[PDB]
Amino acid sequence: GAPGSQGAPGLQGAPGAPGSQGAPGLQ
Amino acid sequence: PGSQGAPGLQGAPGAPGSQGAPGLQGAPGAPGSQGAPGLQGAPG
Helix, strand or coil, rough: CCCCCEEEEEEEECCCCCCCCCCCCCC | CCCCCCCCCCCCCCCCCCCCCCCCCCCCCCCCCCCCCCCCCCCC
């Protein structure tokens, strides 16, 4: 039942969105 | 013929639809015109 050296569909869809830091200096 | 293995394995049928993350707020702000005390309006 193997996929032949490739075919393991283990995927990582949408790990996340970490880059929403934001830093308005707004002196 | 007869075993008819099923190795097509095609995927991602229902994966569509993902609002990942929109940009930041188009622009922040502090709506209001910076009114103030004024200036000299009664010198003498």
